[PDB]
């Protein structure tokens, strides 16, 4: 397979056709990118939105009540960069980070694995600190 840690995507002609990049279509950038995954609870909705002719509001608390790949935006500096994180949701309440992407002047390449692992130790930290609340009662 192709090595998707060596390459840079960039599709101008899309981003003029969008009056260019927002916080509100990135994540659709994204999905035209080598970087997207047709497995992700993204796409499913993205079907369900189209097939029904249905506006289903906001993303994130859509993807709350699915398992499986999902892409979410984790940081915002518009009109420069957004950050988008692969992830794994388990359940309602925890998520395993897989792989962070910037979309950095409509530039999208994977981020070093740091970020991933800084973004897991968040979580961690987090998920073990709400296992410890569950206990007191």
């Known amino acids: 397979h192709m090595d998707l840690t060596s390459i840079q995507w ?9 009056g ?10 994204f999905s035209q990118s080598p970087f997207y995954s047709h497995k992700s609870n993204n796409e499913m909705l993205k079907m369900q939105s189209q097939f029904n002719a249905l506006d289903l ?14 892409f ?10 957004w950050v988008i994180q692969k ?13 962070v992407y910037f979309v950095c002047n409509e530039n999208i ?3 070093p694995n740091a970020y991933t692992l800084l973004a897991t130790r968040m979580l961690n930290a987090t998920y073990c600190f709400q296992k410890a609340l569950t206990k007191i009662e």
Do not use: C
């Open 57 to 70: 509001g906001d993303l994130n608390s859509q993807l709350k009540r699915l398992t499986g790949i999902q």
């Open 72 to 81: 979410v935006i984790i940081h915002e500096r518009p009109p420069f960069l």
């Open 20 to 29: 260019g990049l927002r916080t509100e279509n990135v994540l659709e950038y």
């Open 10 to 18: 960039r599709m101008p002609e899309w981003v003029q056709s969008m």
């Open 87 to 99: 992830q794994n949701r388990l359940n309602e309440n925890e998520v395993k980070p897989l792989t």
């Open 109 to 111: 390449y994977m981020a």
